[PDB]
Design an enzyme around this catalytic site. Structure first.
Site, PDB file in Angstrom:
ATOM      1  N   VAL A 138       0.875  -1.209   0.000  1.00  0.00           N
ATOM      2  CA  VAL A 138       0.000   0.000   0.000  1.00  0.00           C
ATOM      3  C   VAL A 138       0.898   1.242   0.000  1.00  0.00           C
ATOM      4  O   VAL A 138       2.088   1.102   0.368  1.00  0.00           O
ATOM      5  CB  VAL A 138      -0.996  -0.014   1.176  1.00  0.00           C
ATOM      6  N   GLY A 139       0.362   2.374  -0.478  1.00  0.00           N
ATOM      7  CA  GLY A 139       0.978   3.716  -0.396  1.00  0.00           C
ATOM      8  C   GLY A 139       1.791   4.115  -1.620  1.00  0.00           C
ATOM      9  O   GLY A 139       2.067   5.319  -1.750  1.00  0.00           O
ATOM     10  N   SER A 140       2.194   3.159  -2.464  1.00  0.00           N
ATOM     11  CA  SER A 140       3.173   3.359  -3.568  1.00  0.00           C
ATOM     12  C   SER A 140       4.442   4.029  -3.021  1.00  0.00           C
ATOM     13  O   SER A 140       4.982   4.919  -3.710  1.00  0.00           O
ATOM     14  CB  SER A 140       2.579   4.164  -4.702  1.00  0.00           C
ATOM     15  N   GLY A 141       4.888   3.619  -1.827  1.00  0.00           N
ATOM     16  CA  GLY A 141       6.126   4.089  -1.171  1.00  0.00           C
ATOM     17  C   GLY A 141       5.900   5.256  -0.217  1.00  0.00           C
ATOM     18  O   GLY A 141       6.865   5.634   0.474  1.00  0.00           O
TER      19      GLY A 141
ATOM     20  N   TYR B 183       4.255   5.540   2.604  1.00  0.00           N
ATOM     21  CA  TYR B 183       4.230   5.163   4.045  1.00  0.00           C
ATOM     22  C   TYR B 183       5.550   4.489   4.447  1.00  0.00           C
ATOM     23  O   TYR B 183       5.713   4.148   5.632  1.00  0.00           O
ATOM     24  CB  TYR B 183       3.049   4.234   4.355  1.00  0.00           C
ATOM     25  N   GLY B 184       6.474   4.329   3.497  1.00  0.00           N
ATOM     26  CA  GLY B 184       7.641   3.436   3.621  1.00  0.00           C
ATOM     27  C   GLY B 184       7.293   2.035   3.142  1.00  0.00           C
ATOM     28  O   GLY B 184       6.373   1.898   2.327  1.00  0.00           O
TER      29      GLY B 184
ATOM     30  N   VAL C  33       5.322  -0.668   3.560  1.00  0.00           N
ATOM     31  CA  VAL C  33       4.042  -0.931   4.296  1.00  0.00           C
ATOM     32  C   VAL C  33       3.098  -1.798   3.453  1.00  0.00           C
ATOM     33  O   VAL C  33       2.689  -1.356   2.350  1.00  0.00           O
ATOM     34  CB  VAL C  33       3.346   0.373   4.733  1.00  0.00           C
TER      35      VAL C  33
ATOM     36  N   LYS D 217       4.444  -2.593   8.811  1.00  0.00           N
ATOM     37  CA  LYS D 217       5.590  -1.766   8.331  1.00  0.00           C
ATOM     38  C   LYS D 217       6.898  -2.479   8.624  1.00  0.00           C
ATOM     39  O   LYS D 217       7.179  -2.783   9.810  1.00  0.00           O
ATOM     40  CB  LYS D 217       5.593  -0.369   8.978  1.00  0.00           C
TER      41      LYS D 217
ATOM     42  N   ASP E 181       1.577   9.423  12.963  1.00  0.00           N
ATOM     43  CA  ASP E 181       2.755  10.017  12.287  1.00  0.00           C
ATOM     44  C   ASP E 181       3.295  11.153  13.127  1.00  0.00           C
ATOM     45  O   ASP E 181       3.464  12.286  12.641  1.00  0.00           O
ATOM     46  CB  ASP E 181       2.442  10.481  10.858  1.00  0.00           C
TER      47      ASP E 181
END
Ligand SMILES: N#CCC(=O)N1CCC(Cc2ccccc2)CC1
Ligand SMILES: [Cl-]
Ligand SMILES: [Cl-]
Ligand SMILES: [Cl-]
Ligand SMILES: [Cl-]
Ligand SMILES: [Cl-]
Length: 343
Positions: free
Chosen positions: A26-29, A31-32, A34, A49, A161
């Site tokens: 998820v996030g396409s990078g 979120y790091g 993840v 994560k 966050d």
């Protein structure tokens, strides 16, 4: 010790307990490293994560320790919590990787708002209930903004966050700076937890108007927008600005009075206008606290002083400690192996 299995996901080895199934990035990078997963023990959809390079430097090893300590402490409905933490390592000697697990949270305040007065009351109530908890442990968030607020279909909210930020990251026409209190934006003085209340005011104004409150093109444009609304500083605040150069710059600006917030926030609930006046105060010593704001008449529908809990005390004496990479790594290992999951 659970049984672990291995798989490669987008150029990355993941070694996780069998309870976690259907790992999909998820996030396409964003979120790091993840992944979304299904947790067969709890029945929750979860986010997993995998930390990148957690012990690569003293700075990086201490940051890893700091994140794990903060996430293990936070036990509140309106704050990120840790469902699990694990390593595939069987001893300190082979410890390299850390994995963190929490509730899957696919939507942020922007996804829902990029709202009636009732929606604004409930969303801001939940931020303030979470902040009362965080501030009671002497924790400062330092980065409240819509992308750091998770929201679900029932309008239930969690703060995430936490501030654990680059010069380039804060330069120009950027959301990374628009929610920041002026005293931290310009390094005026030692800041404290009142910086978070300024951010809540900025968020609340944008939910009421649909517009960013202080969308500065750079630090100086942004300070001009802030002083136009709240007024230039008086002698009492100028004394508290520790940089002589920052003091001299402020005194170069033509004096301006505070604006009438009922003529700025046209049509808003008068109780919303009054609360914004108490949050968006230039002198941080005079801002309303989270505990005081929960008791404001704007939140009369939601306020319950028997259901607004405080935190256990939080020992951050490590922050002032000078250790070697391997000492920070050993402290982190002990906190992974001592984790006790929530009921
Ligand atoms: N979909 C999506 C995004 C999403 O689910 N969330 C935002 C990214 C954080 C990453 C994280 C994971 C464990 C412990 C701390 C932080 C949590 C989940
Ligand atoms: Cl398992
Ligand atoms: Cl959570
Ligand atoms: Cl490992
Ligand atoms: Cl944002
Ligand atoms: Cl503690």
């Amino acid at each position: 010790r659970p049984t672990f299995y291995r798989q490669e996901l987008n150029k990355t080895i993941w070694e996780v307990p069998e309870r976690y199934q259907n790992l999909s990035p998820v996030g396409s990078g964003a979120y790091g490293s993840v992944c979304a997963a299904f947790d067969t023990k709890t029945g929750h959809r979860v986010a997993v994560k995998k930390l990148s390079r957690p012990f690569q430097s003293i700075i990086h090893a201490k940051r890893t320790y700091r994140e794990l300590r903060l996430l293990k402490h936070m036990k509140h409905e309106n704050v990120i919590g840790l469902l699990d933490v694990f390593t595939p390592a069987r001893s300190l000697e082979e410890f390299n990787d850390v994995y963190l697990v929490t509730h899957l949270m696919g939507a942020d305040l922007n996804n829902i708002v990029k709202l009636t007065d009732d929606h604004v009351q409930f969303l801001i109530y939940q931020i303030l209930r979470g902040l009362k908890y965080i501030h009671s442990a002497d924790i400062i968030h330092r980065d409240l903004k819509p992308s750091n607020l998770a929201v679900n279909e029932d309008c239930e909210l969690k703060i995430l966050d936490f501030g654990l930020h680059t010069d380039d990251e804060m330069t120009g026409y950027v959301a990374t700076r628009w929610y920041r209190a002026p005293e931290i934006m310009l390094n005026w003085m030692h800041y404290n937890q009142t910086v978070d209340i300024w951010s809540v005011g900025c968020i609340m104004a944008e939910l009421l108007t649909g517009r960013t409150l202080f969308p500065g093109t750079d630090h100086i444009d942004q300070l001009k927008l802030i002083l136009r609304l709240v007024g230039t500083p008086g002698a009492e605040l100028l004394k508290k600005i520790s940089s002589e150069s920052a003091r001299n710059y402020i005194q170069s600006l033509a004096q301006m009075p505070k604006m009438n917030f009922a003529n700025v926030f046209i049509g808003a609930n008068p109780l919303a206008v009054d609360l914004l006046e108490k949050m968006l105060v230039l002198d941080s010593d005079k801002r309303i606290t989270a505990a005081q704001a929960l008791a404001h008449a704007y939140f009369a529908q939601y306020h319950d002083p028997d259901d607004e809990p405080v935190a256990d005390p939080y020992d951050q004496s490590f922050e002032s400690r000078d250790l070697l990479i391997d000492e920070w790594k050993s402290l982190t290992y002990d906190e992974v192996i001592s984790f006790v999951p929530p009921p």
